[PDB]
Amino acid sequence: PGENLKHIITLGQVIHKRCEEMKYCKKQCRRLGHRVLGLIKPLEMLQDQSVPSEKLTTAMNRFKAALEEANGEIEKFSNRSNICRFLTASQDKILFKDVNRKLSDVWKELSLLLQVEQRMPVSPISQSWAQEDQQDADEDRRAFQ
Ligand SMILES: [Cl-]
């Protein structure tokens, strides 16, 4: 469990650094990196300190898989010609729509389990993504011309 947590933290840190380097569709890439860094922040605080339930282990594995899926999409979209093909085949122009929904859904479940089982604090503000994604997609579309 300690190794799984460390892996998730490292993977989130790598995704944020990669997002900051992406040359095209920067609003969407930077939003993904910002969101991922925000999710790993309480995990990093937890790491600096219980036996997980069945529900916690599966939530942790789903979160790890969603981050791996995001890392795979960042790799694909680092090449400009892959962005162009995706955008032309897309109606809403949102690069990370599926990855973003998986991350938000799993985080809702995972954060609650960490608060109940592992004494993770309840944050003054929880972690509107779909609406932000359309705005970012529109701004990136204009810059991609
Ligand atoms: Cl661009």
Helix 26-47 / helix 54-77 crossing angle, nearest 10 deg: 150
Nearest residue to 41 via CA among 5, 9, 2: 9
- Read off the tokens for 115: 């608060």
On whether the CB atoms of residues 65 and 132 are closer than 8 A, the answer is: no
Helix 26-47 / helix 2-21 crossing angle, nearest 10 deg: 150
Rounded distance from Cα 72 to ligand 1 centre (Å): 19
Burial class (CB in 10 A: 0-12, 13-18, 19+), 15: buried
- Read off the tokens for 5: 């947590």
Rounded distance from Cα 86 to ligand 1 centre (Å): 14
Rounded distance from Cα 5 to ligand 1 centre (Å): 34
Nearest residue to 12 via CA among 68, 78, 59: 68
Q: How far apart are CA 109 and CA 104, in angstroms?
A: 9
Helix 54-77 / helix 97-118 crossing angle, nearest 10 deg: 150
Rounded distance from Cα 57 to ligand 1 centre (Å): 39
Rounded distance from Cα 80 to ligand 1 centre (Å): 9
Q: Which experiment gave this structure?
A: X-ray
Q: How far apart are CA 22 and CA 24, in angstroms?
A: 6
Q: How far apart are CA 25 and CA 111, in angstroms?
A: 29
- Read off the tokens for 32: 């993904």
How many CA atoms lie within 13 Å of 81's alpha carbon, on the beta-carbon side?
0
On whether the CB atoms of residues 24 and 80 are closer than 8 A, the answer is: yes
Burial 57-95 (b: 16+ CB within 10 A, else e): eebbebbbebbeebbebbeebeeeeebeebbeeeeebbb
Rounded distance from Cα 40 to ligand 1 centre (Å): 27
Resolution for this model in angstroms, one decimal place?
A: 1.4
Rounded distance from Cα 133 to ligand 1 centre (Å): 16
